[PDB]
C-alpha cells in the first residue's frame, strides 16, 4: 500500500505540466524513500529524472516497492482538476490497477476523488553516472527561459560557452546571429536574482533549442535553474523543488 499526502498540491500540478509535453508515458517508482521517475523522450535525445523525497510529503507510507506505468497526458488531466491550494493525497492498493488521487479543499466542504487507470509499459531505462563536470552556472530560471525562447526565433541550435566571468548563448539562422552575454553578478544580494559561475575548464557546447524550451516549462517550480556542463557530454538542467527534490533534464549534444 502506498499513501502520500501533500498540503502543497500545486507542486504536483507543476510537475506534470513540466513533463507531459516531453514524455507521454512514464514509470513512477515508489519506495519508502519516495518517488523517482526517469524517462527518455521518444526521440531519445533527452532524458528526465524526477525525485520527490518522502520527507517532503505531509504523510508518506510505502509498504511495497511499486512501479506504476502511467499515461502522463492523463495524470495531467486529472491534476488540472485540482486547485492550487488543494491538499493532494496519492494512494494505491497493494494490487492496484489504478492510482487514486484525492483533492481536498480548505473548507472541508469540497472533496474530489479521481481514479486513474495504470498501463503496461515497455520502457528503456538508463544508467546515469555521477561525474564531475567542468562548468556550473546557476541563474534566474526566468532569465534562462527568456533566453531559450528568444534565441529560438533566431536559429535552431544554441551554443553555450562558459567562462570564469560569465556565460554566452549564441544561435544562428537564415537571418543572422545573436549573442546574449551574462556576466557573473559582481554585487550579490539575493540568491535567485544572481548569476554565479564555478568552472574548472572553459566549455563550449551546442544544443537543440527545441528541447530546452520543453525544459523551461519547469520554470514555475523554482526561481533558479542550474546548468551543468562538461565537454561533449549531455547537459544537465536542474530545477530544485524546494526542500523536497528536483527535476533534472539531460540533453544530448550536437557532436
Amino acid at each position: 500500500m502506498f499513501e502520500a499526502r501533500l498540503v502543497q498540491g500545486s507542486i504536483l500540478k507543476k510537475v506534470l505540466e513540466a513533463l507531459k509535453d516531453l514524455i507521454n508515458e512514464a514509470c513512477w517508482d515508489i519506495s519508502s524513500s519516495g518517488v523517482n521517475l526517469q524517462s527518455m523522450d521518444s526521440s531519445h535525445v533527452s532524458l528526465v529524472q524526477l525525485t520527490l523525497r518522502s520527507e517532503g510529503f505531509d504523510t508518506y507510507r510505502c509498504d511495497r516497492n511499486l512501479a506504476m506505468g502511467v499515461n502522463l497526458t492523463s495524470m495531467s488531466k486529472i491534476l488540472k482538476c485540482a486547485g492550487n491550494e488543494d491538499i493532494i493525497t496519492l494512494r494505491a492498493e497493494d494490487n492496484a490497477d489504478t492510482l487514486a488521487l484525492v483533492f481536498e479543499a480548505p473548507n472541508q466542504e469540497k472533496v474530489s476523488d479521481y481514479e486513474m487507470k495504470l498501463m503496461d509499459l515497455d520502457v528503456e531505462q538508463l544508467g546515469i553516472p555521477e561525474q564531475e563536470y567542468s562548468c556550473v552556472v546557476k541563474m534566474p530560471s526566468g532569465e534562462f527561459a527568456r533566453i531559450c525562447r528568444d534565441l529560438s526565433h533566431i536559429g535552431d541550435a544554441v551554443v553555450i560557452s562558459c567562462a570564469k566571468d560569465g556565460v554566452k548563448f549564441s544561435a544562428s539562422g537564415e537571418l543572422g546571429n545573436g549573442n546574449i552575454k551574462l556576466s557573473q553578478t559582481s554585487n550579490v544580494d539575493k540568491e535567485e536574482e544572481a548569476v554565479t559561475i564555478e568552472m574548472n575548464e572553459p566549455v563550449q557546447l551546442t544544443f537543440a533549442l527545441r528541447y530546452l524550451n520543453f525544459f523551461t516549462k519547469a520554470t514555475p517550480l523554482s526561481s533558479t535553474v542550474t546548468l551543468i556542463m562538461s565537454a561533449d557530454v549531455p547537459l544537465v538542467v536542474e530545477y530544485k523543488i524546494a526542500d523536497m527534490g528536483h527535476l533534472k533534464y539531460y540533453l544530448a549534444p550536437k557532436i
Binding site: 531519445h44 506504476m68 503496461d120 520502457v123 531505462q125 557532436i255
Partner: peptide, 18 residues
C-alpha cells in the same frame, strides 16, 4: 550531428505491468 543519450549511457530494458 545530434547525439542521443544512449551514446553516453547504458540501456537496460524494463517491463511494467499495469
Amino acid at each position: 550531428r545530434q547525439t542521443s543519450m544512449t551514446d553516453f549511457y547504458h540501456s537496460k530494458r524494463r517491463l511494467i505491468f499495469s
